[PDB]
Amino acid sequence: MPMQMFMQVYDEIQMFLLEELELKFDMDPNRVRYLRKMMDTTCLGGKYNRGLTVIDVAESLLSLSGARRKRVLHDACVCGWMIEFLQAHYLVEDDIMDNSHPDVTVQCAINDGLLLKSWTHMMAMHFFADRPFLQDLLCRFNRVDYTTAVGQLYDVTSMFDSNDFAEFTLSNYKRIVKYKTAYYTYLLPLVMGLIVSEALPTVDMGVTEELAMLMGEYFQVQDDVMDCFTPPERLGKVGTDIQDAKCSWLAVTFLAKASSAQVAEFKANYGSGDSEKVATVRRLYEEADLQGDYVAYEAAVAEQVKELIEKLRLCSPGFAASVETLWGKT
Amino acid sequence: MPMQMFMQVYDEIQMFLLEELELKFDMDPNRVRYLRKMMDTTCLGGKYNRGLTVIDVAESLLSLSGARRKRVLHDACVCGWMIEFLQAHYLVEDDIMDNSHPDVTVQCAINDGLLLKSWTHMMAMHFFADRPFLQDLLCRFNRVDYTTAVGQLYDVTSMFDSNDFAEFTLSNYKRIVKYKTAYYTYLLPLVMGLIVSEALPTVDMGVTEELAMLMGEYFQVQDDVMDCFTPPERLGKVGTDIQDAKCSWLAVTFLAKASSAQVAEFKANYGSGDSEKVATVRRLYEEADLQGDYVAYEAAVAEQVKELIEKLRLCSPGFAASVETLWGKT
Ligand SMILES: CCN(CC)S(=O)(=O)c1ccc(C)cc1
Ligand SMILES: CCN(CC)S(=O)(=O)c1ccc(C)cc1
Ligand code: NA
Ligand code: NA
């Protein structure tokens, strides 16, 4: 029922967007079918955890505050696809960075990125045209999107000086995770579920923001370790954080407990594509027992999460049930 | 006074955006100064015709409907910078297409494009937080931005089949100009001036949209001819429409009046970087007396413009004065 309803609304949203182009933007069928394929390629095939989270928050709040149910659930599905389209937009933008007479494939990739973002506005302005929260929804959505772009800047420049391992600290690592990932992956689905359920001013936002940041941190630390030690055919991709000189949890944790000569060896081998230098970094990580510290770090974070949901439950019990399910996914 | 007030509000807007990053997004001074420089580089130095148009529409409506004057004029200046920032965003996106181990300059260019667009939302949500039109403003702004991205798609793919001179027609040329340029360069400043002046539902939008499309068409046809025949040091850039196989006014007009063998020669030489083939295309344009048809075409368009402003003047006299000044700039 959850996934089945999410996919039906996708068909409804897609048909509105494509018919709107046909009927109001003078688009020819060849381009409509081209955009239908591009939308399917970029928005479908993931796990939809951000979008389904909106629905779960919505159903948990109509059980503890007929016609309002069906409407709130449909609005939750449209909000779920807003985030999924936003995620598709970020992935297209991220491919343009590493993918490389006018090059029409790069022109169309840039265009795809612009269309996917604009589609989030177009579907909200249509399906929520008569909702009292449309203005608040757009503002909280645009602010989270801005937050993510700022987080991207923090991440991309963490090894230089914007016109260098000084910013390789744990507090800066958390700032990157917070802005680049946590706000739109964990906080935004929860907020949108509260908005369509009319129960936004009934929750402790501070505890909610604190939980979203902590859950993103838990997820990103595990992602950083898997990027380094999980082999490609099991991870799903080729891990590249060492070659890309990423400010990863492994890198900042190693620098805190390495000897002066190891730091020299780390700094000499980090951020290179050579197989031996990458392997030297993995050797340094192993010999520093980082995968031992990884277990303890996540355990402590999980304790802060498992104990922060209860504060939220004292005044928002239905909210905390969905936050627990979202945490269980992490 | 007009330009002097527009630049003061720029300083106010910039200081809010940068302080917001410092105070609410945890941004370090090195990055704040980096973004201040990027903002100055991308948003300043143009002619500001889109942004000043908002102010001119605003002042023409407070003269024919003290505290309301100063507020509406400040709101007009913020709306003017929204469009200017949006223009800066499109130019950054356009540079990524032709500008080309992670390449941090391309990463920062993509990031710049995202920040410039998000800044349009952030400045509107702040300076219009207590305005009744904030929601309508955001929706009309997002729809025009969407319109421009659709126009980009029409332009970039006018020579292929989205997975070829069939789309080299005058009606398709107008569709490209309408969506890619006219809506955000001519219609959007007028609309925003009406929104902040509270006089939006007091004008004939059909005549207004018709004028915006016609003015963009007039401007783009002149731009197409200058791109081909005005030498680079006088045009300000190297004209590249022939090499890029653009659907220009010259190309669609030539195909309507060329002989079968000339079309073969045109099709054989169009869309190539070779100096002789580009010169052959210029030779074909000259021998077809296109710069003679150019004068007549603009004259006829100017007549439709000079006569459409009067319809708008019968019910919106103050509006038509600013539209005349905007047309005079064209
Ligand atoms: C603004 C997003 N950024 C790219 C412009 S990003 O932070 O690198 C990013 C890339 C991909 C994903 C799924 C999320 C974020
Ligand atoms: C969405 C805009 N497009 C780029 C993504 S564009 O139509 O090519 C364009 C480029 C530059 C300018 C100033 C205007 C439009
Ligand atoms: Na998701
Ligand atoms: Na301008």
XYZ file of C-alpha atoms and ligand atoms in Angstrom:
692
model
C 0.000 0.000 0.000
C 2.697 2.627 0.852
C 4.980 2.027 -2.131
C 1.984 1.220 -4.337
C 0.376 4.592 -3.569
C 3.660 6.481 -3.980
C 4.078 5.107 -7.508
C 0.487 5.893 -8.523
C 0.940 9.545 -7.549
C 4.152 9.533 -9.590
C 2.086 8.666 -12.664
C -0.385 11.418 -11.783
C 2.376 13.992 -11.218
C 4.222 13.013 -14.388
C 1.065 13.191 -16.500
C 0.265 16.669 -15.191
C 3.802 17.930 -15.817
C 3.966 16.510 -19.341
C 0.452 17.584 -20.330
C 1.201 21.063 -18.962
C 4.213 21.232 -21.286
C 2.074 20.025 -24.193
C -0.899 22.298 -23.495
C 0.714 25.433 -22.007
C 4.357 25.456 -23.186
C 3.873 24.439 -26.847
C 6.031 21.316 -26.557
C 6.120 18.838 -29.420
C 5.497 15.116 -28.784
C 9.103 14.132 -29.562
C 10.336 16.369 -26.746
C 7.530 15.321 -24.380
C 8.517 11.668 -24.765
C 12.173 12.658 -24.371
C 11.383 14.399 -21.076
C 9.208 11.499 -19.911
C 12.193 9.190 -20.393
C 14.598 11.604 -18.677
C 12.224 11.943 -15.713
C 11.851 8.167 -15.381
C 15.625 7.690 -15.631
C 16.544 10.256 -12.982
C 13.670 10.002 -10.488
C 12.960 6.245 -10.448
C 15.086 3.292 -9.386
C 16.226 4.450 -5.951
C 14.840 3.351 -2.612
C 12.544 6.390 -2.094
C 13.362 6.600 1.621
C 13.045 10.393 1.601
C 9.682 10.296 -0.163
C 8.188 7.397 1.781
C 9.243 9.099 5.030
C 6.791 11.920 4.270
C 3.975 9.392 3.915
C 4.885 7.589 7.148
C 4.901 10.838 9.129
C 1.526 11.668 7.576
C -0.127 8.356 8.458
C 1.241 8.410 12.015
C -0.419 11.792 12.626
C -3.888 11.012 11.260
C -3.995 8.212 13.861
C -3.437 10.604 16.795
C -3.975 14.342 16.257
C -12.252 10.214 5.799
C -12.032 13.229 3.508
C -9.117 14.763 5.417
C -7.317 11.403 5.380
C -7.344 10.954 1.599
C -6.300 14.576 1.026
C -3.439 14.617 3.549
C -2.125 11.300 2.210
C -2.175 12.567 -1.383
C -0.445 15.788 -0.318
C 2.164 13.689 1.488
C 2.810 11.764 -1.736
C 3.299 14.969 -3.730
C 5.689 16.232 -1.046
C 7.546 12.929 -1.201
C 8.067 13.331 -4.932
C 9.230 16.928 -4.457
C 12.137 15.613 -2.367
C 12.786 12.737 -4.782
C 12.872 15.153 -7.726
C 15.173 17.398 -5.673
C 17.445 14.404 -5.051
C 17.396 13.626 -8.788
C 18.401 17.250 -9.401
C 21.413 16.995 -7.072
C 22.544 13.735 -8.695
C 22.411 15.256 -12.189
C 24.407 18.247 -10.935
C 26.922 15.855 -9.364
C 27.348 13.944 -12.644
C 28.142 17.132 -14.584
C 31.158 17.676 -12.318
C 32.820 14.315 -13.027
C 31.523 13.623 -16.555
C 34.163 16.010 -17.945
C 31.564 22.732 -31.151
C 28.779 22.713 -28.545
C 28.529 19.514 -26.498
C 24.783 18.881 -26.590
C 24.977 16.086 -23.996
C 26.441 18.489 -21.425
C 23.931 21.139 -22.514
C 21.101 18.657 -22.019
C 22.510 17.532 -18.665
C 22.548 21.109 -17.376
C 19.042 21.573 -18.785
C 17.912 18.348 -17.079
C 19.195 19.663 -13.760
C 17.263 22.913 -14.153
C 14.064 21.120 -15.193
C 14.148 18.677 -12.267
C 14.411 21.506 -9.737
C 11.729 23.575 -11.484
C 9.455 20.526 -11.530
C 9.469 20.541 -7.707
C 7.943 24.030 -7.795
C 5.512 23.228 -10.615
C 4.042 20.177 -8.883
C 3.699 22.029 -5.562
C 2.077 25.122 -7.089
C -0.474 22.893 -8.835
C -1.416 20.237 -6.279
C -1.272 22.685 -3.341
C -2.721 25.731 -5.139
C -5.611 25.820 -2.624
C -3.668 24.767 0.458
C -3.056 27.260 3.284
C 0.504 25.939 3.744
C 1.686 26.438 0.140
C 3.668 29.577 0.988
C 5.234 28.114 4.125
C 5.971 24.892 2.232
C 7.779 26.702 -0.588
C 9.852 28.769 1.848
C 10.979 25.827 3.982
C 11.714 23.868 0.795
C 13.765 26.658 -0.789
C 15.684 27.181 2.453
C 16.661 23.510 2.721
C 17.736 23.511 -0.933
C 19.878 26.589 -0.236
C 21.274 24.803 2.826
C 22.337 21.869 0.641
C 24.151 24.128 -1.836
C 26.042 25.711 1.058
C 26.918 22.229 2.306
C 28.219 21.359 -1.158
C 30.533 24.377 -1.006
C 31.854 23.277 2.396
C 32.503 19.781 1.030
C 34.083 20.693 -2.310
C 36.496 23.219 -0.766
C 37.432 21.320 2.400
C 40.993 20.753 1.104
C 41.859 24.265 -0.148
C 41.524 27.982 0.643
C 38.627 29.531 -1.277
C 39.992 32.469 -3.274
C 45.220 21.876 3.231
C 44.190 19.806 6.257
C 43.388 22.718 8.587
C 39.652 22.110 8.125
C 40.017 18.335 8.666
C 38.347 18.426 12.068
C 35.360 16.620 13.530
C 33.309 19.794 13.994
C 33.820 20.762 10.349
C 33.031 17.199 9.292
C 29.714 17.531 11.124
C 29.072 20.893 9.462
C 29.538 19.297 6.040
C 27.248 16.370 6.869
C 24.675 18.675 8.466
C 24.322 21.057 5.540
C 25.120 18.773 2.603
C 23.010 15.759 3.586
C 21.148 15.789 6.897
C 18.835 18.755 6.268
C 17.306 17.503 3.015
C 17.573 13.749 3.624
C 16.380 13.570 7.249
C 14.916 16.887 8.400
C 13.050 17.899 5.231
C 10.880 14.736 4.912
C 9.840 15.032 8.563
C 8.974 18.726 8.237
C 6.924 18.208 5.071
C 5.018 15.369 6.732
C 4.161 17.728 9.590
C 3.160 20.489 7.164
C 0.632 18.423 5.207
C -0.625 16.890 8.474
C -1.228 20.424 9.855
C 0.793 19.457 12.961
C 3.937 21.533 12.408
C 3.588 23.901 15.431
C 2.919 20.907 17.706
C 6.464 19.466 17.874
C 9.787 20.374 19.463
C 11.721 21.468 16.386
C 14.990 21.681 18.319
C 14.904 18.006 19.275
C 13.725 17.264 15.733
C 16.628 19.134 14.133
C 19.000 17.510 16.626
C 17.747 14.049 15.649
C 18.007 14.744 11.912
C 21.618 15.915 12.276
C 22.520 12.907 14.423
C 20.906 10.422 12.033
C 22.681 11.951 9.042
C 25.939 11.758 10.989
C 25.356 8.077 11.817
C 24.570 7.313 8.174
C 27.504 9.291 6.756
C 30.122 7.741 9.058
C 29.018 4.257 7.999
C 29.032 5.436 4.381
C 32.589 6.757 4.760
C 33.894 3.453 6.140
C 32.140 1.418 3.430
C 33.513 3.743 0.748
C 37.017 2.756 1.871
C 36.837 -0.923 2.857
C 33.789 -2.400 1.093
C 34.920 -3.755 -2.313
C 33.247 -2.205 -5.370
C 31.002 -5.097 -6.444
C 29.597 -5.185 -2.890
C 29.407 -1.416 -2.308
C 27.759 -0.734 -5.677
C 30.381 1.805 -6.753
C 34.126 2.361 -6.745
C 35.041 4.129 -3.512
C 36.934 7.322 -4.290
C 37.154 9.426 -1.092
C 40.910 8.897 -0.678
C 41.661 9.796 -4.309
C 39.360 12.827 -4.068
C 40.922 13.999 -0.770
C 37.520 13.981 0.902
C 37.050 15.240 4.455
C 35.823 11.845 5.594
C 35.246 10.539 9.101
C 38.211 8.197 8.620
C 40.547 11.042 7.652
C 39.666 13.377 10.532
C 39.736 10.519 13.062
C 43.124 9.306 11.825
C 44.699 12.762 12.084
C 43.701 13.019 15.747
C 45.495 9.801 16.769
C 48.400 9.532 14.297
C 52.048 10.155 15.094
C 53.910 13.065 13.523
C 55.659 10.741 11.053
C 52.412 8.957 10.144
C 50.732 12.315 9.461
C 53.646 13.073 7.141
C 53.035 9.724 5.431
C 49.282 10.362 5.325
C 49.705 13.885 3.947
C 52.166 12.585 1.350
C 49.766 9.882 0.093
C 46.309 11.479 0.427
C 44.453 12.802 -2.596
C 46.241 10.757 -5.264
C 44.916 8.296 -7.813
C 47.942 6.000 -7.607
C 46.957 2.544 -6.369
C 49.904 2.290 -3.972
C 49.260 5.639 -2.281
C 45.565 4.819 -1.819
C 46.583 1.443 -0.388
C 49.059 3.175 1.933
C 46.193 5.305 3.266
C 44.074 2.187 3.795
C 47.058 0.628 5.563
C 47.344 3.641 7.878
C 43.607 3.510 8.628
C 43.798 -0.208 9.470
C 46.895 0.054 11.663
C 45.259 2.890 13.631
C 42.306 0.597 14.503
C 39.812 2.975 12.915
C 37.262 0.221 12.313
C 37.396 -0.351 16.064
C 36.679 3.298 16.801
C 33.938 3.163 14.157
C 31.885 0.699 16.214
C 32.153 2.799 19.375
C 31.390 6.081 17.590
C 28.200 4.756 15.985
C 27.173 3.100 19.260
C 27.451 6.422 21.096
C 25.549 8.236 18.339
C 22.849 5.560 18.372
C 22.492 6.131 22.120
C 21.954 9.863 21.581
C 19.346 9.020 18.930
C 17.625 6.291 20.966
C 17.347 8.765 23.860
C 16.379 11.917 21.939
C 13.249 10.356 20.406
C 11.754 10.120 23.898
C 11.895 13.877 24.483
C 9.977 14.284 21.223
C 7.522 11.573 22.320
C 6.522 13.392 25.527
C 4.682 16.081 23.530
C 4.419 14.496 20.043
C 3.824 10.749 20.430
C 2.679 9.961 16.886
C 5.600 11.917 15.429
C 8.132 9.808 17.344
C 6.803 6.550 15.892
C 7.701 7.616 12.348
C 11.061 9.048 13.442
C 11.815 5.634 14.946
C 10.995 3.922 11.643
C 13.198 6.412 9.791
C 16.004 5.740 12.277
C 15.471 2.008 11.826
C 16.120 2.478 8.107
C 19.485 4.046 9.016
C 18.558 58.627 -8.484
C 17.313 55.412 -10.221
C 20.688 53.722 -10.686
C 21.959 55.228 -7.428
C 19.084 53.670 -5.465
C 19.409 50.320 -7.253
C 23.060 50.047 -6.205
C 22.364 50.996 -2.578
C 19.803 48.197 -2.267
C 22.402 45.857 -3.767
C 24.674 46.641 -0.818
C 21.776 46.062 1.573
C 20.805 42.763 -0.084
C 24.397 41.541 -0.228
C 25.025 42.387 3.426
C 21.910 40.494 4.503
C 22.812 37.436 2.423
C 26.409 37.334 3.656
C 25.563 38.025 7.301
C 22.869 35.333 7.118
C 25.538 32.865 5.981
C 27.834 34.008 8.792
C 25.181 34.012 11.522
C 22.835 31.174 10.481
C 24.862 28.856 8.205
C 28.158 28.735 10.152
C 30.229 30.147 7.285
C 33.835 31.129 7.897
C 35.104 34.589 6.866
C 37.333 33.212 4.089
C 34.290 31.707 2.376
C 32.115 34.771 3.045
C 34.646 37.000 1.287
C 34.917 34.421 -1.501
C 31.145 34.527 -2.016
C 31.090 38.329 -1.822
C 33.594 38.416 -4.685
C 31.688 35.800 -6.704
C 28.437 37.738 -6.240
C 30.051 41.012 -7.329
C 31.644 39.316 -10.349
C 28.466 37.665 -11.622
C 25.749 40.181 -10.709
C 27.484 43.524 -11.374
C 28.842 45.067 -14.558
C 25.849 44.659 -16.864
C 23.358 47.327 -17.841
C 20.649 46.314 -15.309
C 17.836 46.911 -17.809
C 15.756 44.088 -16.328
C 16.190 45.371 -12.778
C 15.723 49.063 -13.527
C 12.566 48.212 -15.495
C 10.939 47.041 -12.250
C 11.701 50.401 -10.643
C 10.361 52.379 -13.614
C 7.079 50.451 -13.605
C 6.852 51.079 -9.858
C 7.398 54.839 -10.064
C 4.960 55.218 -12.970
C 2.189 53.630 -10.880
C 2.635 55.633 -7.672
C 2.014 58.728 -9.829
C -1.408 57.494 -11.018
C -3.115 54.665 -9.111
C 4.859 58.916 1.532
C 5.153 55.692 3.508
C 3.712 53.562 0.702
C 6.058 55.244 -1.789
C 9.289 54.396 0.041
C 8.150 50.813 0.671
C 6.991 50.083 -2.889
C 10.201 51.568 -4.307
C 12.371 49.444 -2.006
C 10.351 46.341 -2.894
C 10.814 47.196 -6.571
C 14.584 47.334 -6.039
C 14.626 43.914 -4.368
C 12.552 42.523 -7.245
C 14.979 44.092 -9.701
C 17.887 42.302 -8.059
C 15.965 39.012 -8.072
C 15.880 39.186 -11.881
C 19.510 40.329 -12.074
C 20.599 37.438 -9.847
C 18.482 35.119 -12.011
C 20.255 36.475 -15.099
C 23.617 35.912 -13.380
C 22.497 32.335 -12.697
C 21.695 31.695 -16.373
C 25.044 33.142 -17.481
C 26.976 30.893 -15.082
C 25.008 27.891 -16.353
C 25.784 28.951 -19.929
C 29.524 29.176 -19.189
C 29.624 25.627 -17.793
C 28.451 24.336 -21.183
C 31.290 25.876 -23.216
C 34.063 25.970 -20.587
C 34.707 22.254 -21.199
C 40.860 14.093 -10.160
C 37.958 16.414 -9.299
C 37.944 19.720 -11.186
C 37.216 22.164 -8.367
C 36.689 25.094 -10.758
C 33.825 23.257 -12.476
C 32.532 22.146 -9.069
C 32.591 25.750 -7.876
C 30.947 26.969 -11.087
C 28.050 24.551 -10.633
C 27.862 25.581 -6.974
C 27.866 29.262 -7.993
C 24.926 28.617 -10.303
C 22.939 26.953 -7.521
C 23.742 29.716 -5.021
C 22.733 32.534 -7.383
C 19.312 30.983 -7.989
C 18.796 30.208 -4.293
C 19.752 33.791 -3.444
C 16.712 35.000 -5.423
C 14.481 33.032 -3.045
C 16.406 34.039 0.083
C 16.196 37.770 -0.625
C 12.478 37.562 -1.471
C 11.569 35.493 1.598
C 13.358 38.030 3.808
C 12.443 41.438 2.384
C 8.863 40.380 1.540
C 8.246 38.170 4.597
C 5.328 40.432 5.622
C 4.024 41.227 2.150
C 0.652 39.851 1.006
C 2.061 39.160 -2.482
C 5.017 36.987 -1.401
C 3.289 33.745 -2.402
C 2.044 35.078 -5.735
C 5.468 36.616 -6.378
C 7.300 33.332 -5.777
C 4.904 31.396 -8.016
C 5.102 33.802 -10.957
C 8.889 33.931 -10.525
C 9.296 30.146 -10.439
C 7.027 29.765 -13.468
C 9.046 32.223 -15.562
C 12.272 30.482 -14.529
C 10.744 27.155 -15.600
C 9.677 28.808 -18.863
C 13.281 29.853 -19.522
C 14.606 26.323 -18.957
C 12.046 25.011 -21.444
C 13.157 27.690 -23.902
C 16.759 26.574 -23.427
C 15.748 23.030 -24.373
C 14.027 24.292 -27.531
C 17.152 26.260 -28.464
C 19.801 23.636 -27.702
C 17.974 20.873 -29.603
C 16.745 22.891 -32.590
C 19.151 21.042 -34.931
C 18.556 17.422 -33.843
C 15.866 14.928 -32.792
C 15.696 14.620 -29.003
C 16.147 10.948 -28.112
C 18.150 18.613 -39.024
C 16.527 21.758 -40.433
C 12.899 20.638 -40.064
C 12.455 22.939 -37.054
C 14.127 25.889 -38.836
C 10.872 27.792 -39.237
C 9.759 31.257 -38.201
C 7.096 29.990 -35.793
C 9.635 27.788 -34.005
C 12.113 30.667 -33.979
C 9.479 32.744 -32.183
C 8.832 29.904 -29.735
C 12.531 29.814 -28.852
C 12.723 33.590 -28.403
C 9.461 33.647 -26.443
C 10.421 31.019 -23.887
C 14.198 31.451 -23.739
C 14.369 35.250 -23.540
C 11.160 37.273 -23.761
C 9.395 35.957 -20.646
C 12.175 36.703 -18.156
C 13.752 39.711 -19.888
C 10.607 41.646 -20.870
C 7.501 40.178 -19.236
C 8.918 39.347 -15.794
C 10.182 42.877 -14.923
C 6.812 44.365 -15.887
C 4.862 41.811 -13.844
C 7.027 42.283 -10.748
C 6.628 46.055 -11.004
C 2.857 45.569 -11.041
C 3.023 43.146 -8.108
C 4.901 45.476 -5.754
C 2.735 48.393 -6.935
C -0.407 46.376 -6.033
C -1.751 47.069 -9.553
C -1.455 43.600 -11.096
C -5.209 42.892 -11.618
C -5.639 46.332 -13.224
C -3.940 45.650 -16.587
C -4.674 43.694 -19.754
C -2.222 40.825 -19.350
C -2.879 39.555 -22.875
C -1.726 42.798 -24.480
C 1.120 42.866 -21.954
C 2.283 39.350 -22.833
C 1.879 40.178 -26.525
C 4.100 43.247 -26.137
C 6.778 41.362 -24.192
C 6.966 38.654 -26.869
C 7.121 41.234 -29.661
C 9.839 43.272 -27.944
C 11.945 40.173 -27.319
C 11.488 39.232 -30.972
C 12.595 42.701 -32.119
C 15.652 42.546 -29.860
C 16.623 38.987 -30.821
C 16.406 39.566 -34.587
C 18.749 42.548 -34.283
C 21.004 40.450 -32.048
C 21.083 37.658 -34.643
C 22.125 40.012 -37.453
C 24.819 41.667 -35.316
C 26.137 38.252 -34.274
C 26.828 37.542 -37.953
C 27.930 40.848 -39.501
C 29.186 43.049 -36.645
C 32.948 42.425 -36.220
C 34.050 41.105 -32.816
C 35.748 44.219 -31.409
C 32.548 46.171 -32.156
C 30.041 43.494 -31.094
C 31.857 42.743 -27.828
C 32.166 39.018 -28.538
C 33.001 36.608 -31.336
C 29.779 35.774 -33.164
C 29.286 32.015 -33.239
C 25.705 31.271 -34.389
C 26.791 29.840 -37.754
C 29.428 27.570 -36.188
C 26.942 26.477 -33.511
C 24.178 25.790 -36.078
C 21.830 28.136 -34.245
C 18.203 28.535 -35.301
C 18.718 32.218 -36.006
C 16.448 34.677 -37.778
C 18.962 34.801 -40.636
C 18.938 31.020 -41.077
C 15.153 30.574 -41.114
C 14.673 33.598 -43.393
C 17.320 32.368 -45.835
C 15.769 28.902 -46.108
C 12.423 30.403 -47.125
C 13.852 32.318 -50.110
C 16.836 30.203 -51.227
C 16.979 28.046 -54.334
C 17.257 24.269 -54.067
C 20.972 24.382 -54.926
C 21.651 27.205 -52.453
C 19.914 25.230 -49.688
C 22.239 22.352 -50.560
C 25.177 24.758 -50.268
C 23.788 26.202 -47.029
C 23.153 22.765 -45.522
C 26.646 21.655 -46.552
C 28.342 24.643 -44.867
C 26.188 25.317 -41.782
C 27.329 24.283 -38.323
C 31.067 24.093 -39.022
C 33.986 25.908 -37.445
C 35.949 26.184 -40.692
C 36.491 29.820 -41.659
C 35.614 29.236 -45.318
C 32.311 27.485 -44.603
C 31.257 30.227 -42.171
C 32.210 32.805 -44.803
C 30.203 30.883 -47.410
C 27.154 31.147 -45.139
C 27.737 34.887 -44.731
C 28.059 35.108 -48.514
C 24.719 33.331 -48.968
C 23.061 35.645 -46.430
C 24.411 38.740 -48.211
C 23.469 37.605 -51.718
C 19.916 36.869 -50.524
C 19.538 40.511 -49.366
C 18.790 39.445 -45.802
C 19.948 42.762 -44.352
C 17.313 44.346 -46.578
C 14.586 42.091 -45.217
C 15.927 42.793 -41.720
C 14.971 46.475 -41.943
C 11.436 45.697 -43.113
C 10.891 42.944 -40.531
C 11.898 45.154 -37.596
C 9.860 48.049 -39.003
C 6.735 45.879 -39.104
C 7.391 44.570 -35.588
C 7.959 48.109 -34.321
C 4.574 49.052 -35.789
C 2.871 46.227 -33.885
C 4.630 47.413 -30.717
C 3.932 51.122 -31.278
C 0.246 50.252 -31.756
C -0.184 47.666 -28.983
C 0.908 50.051 -26.208
C -2.192 52.148 -26.900
C -4.595 49.306 -26.107
C -2.802 48.950 -22.770
C -2.987 52.729 -22.259
C -6.795 52.857 -22.536
C -7.185 51.069 -19.180
C -3.661 51.334 -17.680
C -2.172 54.720 -18.612
C 0.710 54.805 -16.127
C 1.720 51.258 -17.065
C 2.079 52.197 -20.742
C 4.547 54.994 -19.984
C 7.070 52.544 -18.525
C 6.464 49.997 -21.297
C 7.298 52.768 -23.769
C 10.575 53.486 -21.963
C 11.400 49.770 -21.956
C 10.630 49.618 -25.683
C 12.794 52.690 -26.226
C 15.696 50.783 -24.671
C 15.166 48.068 -27.307
C 23.690 20.718 -4.109
C 24.103 19.223 -4.176
N 25.524 19.026 -4.556
C 25.846 18.905 -6.000
C 25.670 20.295 -6.658
S 26.334 17.952 -3.572
O 26.289 18.410 -2.198
O 27.635 17.635 -4.132
C 25.260 16.545 -3.740
C 25.403 15.666 -4.816
C 24.553 14.562 -4.939
C 23.555 14.328 -3.987
C 22.622 13.118 -4.120
C 23.414 15.208 -2.910
C 24.265 16.310 -2.788
C 18.069 28.519 -18.514
C 19.035 29.455 -19.287
N 19.871 28.739 -20.283
C 21.179 28.200 -19.832
C 20.915 26.988 -18.906
S 19.902 29.473 -21.780
O 18.555 29.577 -22.306
O 20.908 28.856 -22.624
C 20.452 31.092 -21.292
C 21.813 31.362 -21.132
C 22.235 32.639 -20.749
C 21.301 33.655 -20.523
C 21.762 35.056 -20.103
C 19.939 33.383 -20.684
C 19.518 32.107 -21.069
Na 15.254 8.916 -1.369
Na 19.562 43.131 -17.023
